Scaffold this active site. Structure first.
Site, mmCIF file in Angstrom:
data_model
loop_
_atom_site.group_PDB
_atom_site.id
_atom_site.type_symbol
_atom_site.label_atom_id
_atom_site.label_comp_id
_atom_site.label_asym_id
_atom_site.label_seq_id
_atom_site.Cartn_x
_atom_site.Cartn_y
_atom_site.Cartn_z
ATOM 1 C CB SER A 1 -0.892 0.059 1.248
ATOM 2 O OG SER A 1 -1.541 1.299 1.368
ATOM 3 C CE1 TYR B 1 -3.215 -2.121 5.729
ATOM 4 C CE2 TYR B 1 -2.977 0.188 5.231
ATOM 5 C CZ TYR B 1 -3.235 -1.057 4.817
ATOM 6 O OH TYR B 1 -3.674 -1.304 3.529
HETATM 7 N N1 LIG Z 1 -8.001 1.187 0.147
HETATM 8 C C1 LIG Z 1 -7.840 -0.064 -0.165
HETATM 9 O O1 LIG Z 1 -8.746 -0.873 -0.353
HETATM 10 C C2 LIG Z 1 -6.460 -0.534 -0.199
HETATM 11 C C3 LIG Z 1 -5.443 0.300 -0.556
HETATM 12 C C4 LIG Z 1 -4.159 -0.215 -0.517
HETATM 13 C C5 LIG Z 1 -3.965 -1.542 -0.138
HETATM 14 N N2 LIG Z 1 -4.979 -2.308 0.243
HETATM 15 C C6 LIG Z 1 -4.734 -3.743 0.572
HETATM 16 O O2 LIG Z 1 -5.591 -4.501 -0.251
HETATM 17 C C7 LIG Z 1 -5.732 -5.782 0.261
HETATM 18 C C8 LIG Z 1 -7.190 -6.195 0.044
HETATM 19 O O3 LIG Z 1 -8.122 -5.571 0.952
HETATM 20 P P1 LIG Z 1 -9.405 -4.921 0.310
HETATM 21 O O4 LIG Z 1 -9.143 -3.449 0.071
HETATM 22 O O5 LIG Z 1 -9.706 -5.769 -0.863
HETATM 23 O O6 LIG Z 1 -10.411 -5.164 1.531
HETATM 24 P P2 LIG Z 1 -11.599 -6.258 1.668
HETATM 25 O O7 LIG Z 1 -12.808 -6.008 0.807
HETATM 26 O O8 LIG Z 1 -11.836 -6.186 3.168
HETATM 27 O O9 LIG Z 1 -11.027 -7.675 1.252
HETATM 28 C C9 LIG Z 1 -10.193 -8.261 2.250
HETATM 29 C C10 LIG Z 1 -10.246 -9.724 1.987
HETATM 30 O O10 LIG Z 1 -9.384 -10.393 2.906
HETATM 31 C C11 LIG Z 1 -10.072 -11.408 3.593
HETATM 32 N N3 LIG Z 1 -9.684 -11.542 5.028
HETATM 33 C C12 LIG Z 1 -9.832 -10.647 6.017
HETATM 34 N N4 LIG Z 1 -9.453 -11.179 7.196
HETATM 35 C C13 LIG Z 1 -9.067 -12.454 6.951
HETATM 36 C C14 LIG Z 1 -8.550 -13.597 7.717
HETATM 37 N N5 LIG Z 1 -8.385 -13.490 9.071
HETATM 38 N N6 LIG Z 1 -8.256 -14.747 7.048
HETATM 39 C C15 LIG Z 1 -8.401 -14.891 5.747
HETATM 40 N N7 LIG Z 1 -8.884 -13.879 5.042
HETATM 41 C C16 LIG Z 1 -9.242 -12.687 5.552
HETATM 42 C C17 LIG Z 1 -11.602 -10.971 3.513
HETATM 43 O O11 LIG Z 1 -12.605 -12.018 3.617
HETATM 44 P P3 LIG Z 1 -13.184 -12.540 5.004
HETATM 45 O O12 LIG Z 1 -13.420 -11.348 5.842
HETATM 46 O O13 LIG Z 1 -14.476 -13.266 4.696
HETATM 47 O O14 LIG Z 1 -12.074 -13.320 5.662
HETATM 48 C C18 LIG Z 1 -11.643 -10.221 2.183
HETATM 49 O O15 LIG Z 1 -11.833 -11.078 1.076
HETATM 50 C C19 LIG Z 1 -5.294 -5.688 1.708
HETATM 51 O O16 LIG Z 1 -4.115 -6.424 1.850
HETATM 52 C C20 LIG Z 1 -5.096 -4.220 1.950
HETATM 53 O O17 LIG Z 1 -4.073 -3.889 2.921
HETATM 54 C C21 LIG Z 1 -6.208 -1.830 0.175
#
Ligand SMILES: NC(=O)c1ccc[n+]([C@@H]2O[C@H](COP(=O)([O-])OP(=O)(O)OC[C@H]3O[C@@H](n4cnc5c(N)ncnc54)[C@H](OP(=O)(O)O)[C@@H]3O)[C@@H](O)[C@H]2O)c1
Ligand SMILES: NC(=O)c1ccc[n+]([C@@H]2O[C@H](COP(=O)([O-])OP(=O)(O)OC[C@H]3O[C@@H](n4cnc5c(N)ncnc54)[C@H](OP(=O)(O)O)[C@@H]3O)[C@@H](O)[C@H]2O)c1
Lengths: 256, 257
Positions: A138, A151
């Site tokens: 990120s 984070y």
């Molecule tokens: N603003 C942003 O969205 C953004 C920006 C930069 C980077 N990121 C990164 O993008 C990545 C994806 O997150 P997202 O933005 O797509 O959020 P998201 O919609 O919350 O997706 C997160 C995914 O991870 C899974 N997860 C969460 N806790 C878990 C656990 N204990 N075990 C296994 N799986 C788990 C969730 O499913 P379940 O809850 O059903 O487990 C969900 O599919 C992350 O690594 C985040 O740091 C995001």
């Protein structure tokens, strides 16, 4: 025959869109997250729409037994040639409002699990002379100012690990990509107790993943879709190496 | 009255020299590591030589119950006003030679435990309007080329956390220092299966800690004793901010269409 893709955090957000997109390219998939019911609906949709095999694999990557079961599958299944280490969560509240349990969870998911899954495929990838590891970092890993100290630290970790893995593993034919989104419209915000609609600017998840996949197809090492001037990356990396060139390790510097 | 210092990884190396040095400045100490017998000898020496109170506190910071007991002590004891988060280990072998157990241990010690101990004092430090947290990172956190991809990652973590904690906590009067040694003559090398005598250049532990403590007394945020040109740090931090100034978050860049 195209490699099967194992995607963590496939149930929503960036993971889910990667799954849709790779299914449309013709890859079989292994989708992992905690929400089995939601994974089973997504898998069924992709099997039907795209005609690829899709397996829904329930796992809490912060539970030792579940993580170990995913490690096993990555070690043993030669069909899996792409790992998307996407599962992750953000920090909820500032540093003093953190908990021991919360810190454990945030670090274990974003760092320990990610590193362990990568370590589960790397030996097999080295032996086959091929494979791909896509780690989601990120932009916050460049921004202590943003206020999510832990984070952001986990995301500095993911960038560095990705750089290190590239140097160690590309000589054996492995592609290691770091993908660094900024604010993107997923469930992460609500999970952390933030209203996504209060952020000044937010990228649609479709646009981020398509950008990431342009990077992937060009075999780009560090892919930062919201960075409008590419040369800032090179300049950051140059300054890092510049600093390294002026380390003299035998003696402390005169100023000390 | 001078604040008590809790030092993790006090039984040897950088931790042990910090302990000796802070005892000579007149601070009472809490020394933590696994090797109780070695801690008891060191504590006795420092009590005798320097006339300060020194408590030896056994803890394996990768064991949940021990870590929780150190957290408790940091939360509850108002005497402790300096935390040295020094306990840490390097990586043994390259990435493919890693183990699940070894990865767990390396990350838990260098990252999870460090972060949790800092989180155990921060609330109390904020309430008192004073306190100091010294986190030991590494130059390796600038060097994916060095070949320790996980260990280096843990040290990128420690630098970033330190920067973030400074911005969050200095407005409440807390000092947060990142200390970044390069190769230094301690037990870390042999722990990882490396002969320290094969390294081109290695700093004596006395010289590193004294340098670090010059930084500490000047209240320096990021202290890198083996960096012979200070301005390379400012230039790295500038380029980071430079990159941040050209993030436009609504739309992907033209090069990605
Ligand atoms: N603003 C942003 O969205 C953004 C920006 C930069 C980077 N990121 C990164 O993008 C990545 C994806 O997150 P997202 O933005 O797509 O959020 P998201 O919609 O919350 O997706 C997160 C995914 O991870 C899974 N997860 C969460 N806790 C878990 C656990 N204990 N075990 C296994 N799986 C788990 C969730 O499913 P379940 O809850 O059903 O487990 C969900 O599919 C992350 O690594 C985040 O740091 C995001
Ligand atoms: N070249 C260098 O030495 C160098 C350079 C940059 C940064 N560093 C950092 O400096 C810090 C100190 O290491 P060192 O160089 O002083 O090596 P060291 O001599 O091996 O000291 C490590 C200390 O941490 C303790 N430790 C190890 N595992 C532990 C555990 N599970 N729980 C509690 N304590 C544990 C050790 O004692 P017990 O084993 O008795 O538990 C020892 O007291 C580390 O954070 C390291 O990453 C070192």
């Amino acid at each position: 025959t195209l490699p099967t893709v194992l995607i963590t955090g496939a149930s929503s957000g960036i993971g889910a869109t990667y799954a849709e997109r790779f299914a449309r390219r013709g890859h079989d998939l292994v989708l992992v997250a905690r929400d089995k019911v939601r994974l089973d609906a997504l898998a069924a949709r992709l099997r039907d729409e795209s005609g690829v095999a899709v397996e829904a694999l329930q796992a809490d990557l912060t539970r030792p037994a579940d993580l170990a079961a995913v490690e096993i599958r990555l070690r043993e299944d030669a069909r899996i040639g792409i790992l998307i280490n996407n599962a992750g969560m953000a920090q909820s509240g500032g540093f003093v409002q953190q908990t021991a349990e919360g810190i454990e969870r945030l670090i274990t998911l974003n760092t320990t699990a990610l590193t362990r899954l990568a370590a589960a495929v790397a030996p097999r990838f080295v032996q086959s002379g091929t494979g791909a590891i896509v780690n989601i970092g990120s932009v916050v890993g460049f921004a202590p100012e943003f206020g999510m100290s832990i984070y952001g630290a986990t995301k500095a970790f993911v960038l560095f690990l990705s750089q290190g893995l590239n140097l160690e593993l590309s000589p054996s034919g492995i592609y290691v990509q770091a993908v660094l989104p900024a604010a993107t419209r997923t469930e992460i915000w609500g999970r952390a107790g933030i209203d996504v609609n209060t952020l000044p600017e937010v990228m649609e998840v479709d646009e981020l993943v398509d950008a990431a996949l342009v990077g992937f197809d060009r075999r780009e090492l560090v892919t930062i879709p919201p960075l409008h001037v590419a040369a800032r990356w090179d300049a950051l990396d140059g300054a890092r190496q510049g600093l390294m060139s002026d380390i003299r390790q035998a003696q402390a510097a005169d100023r000390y």
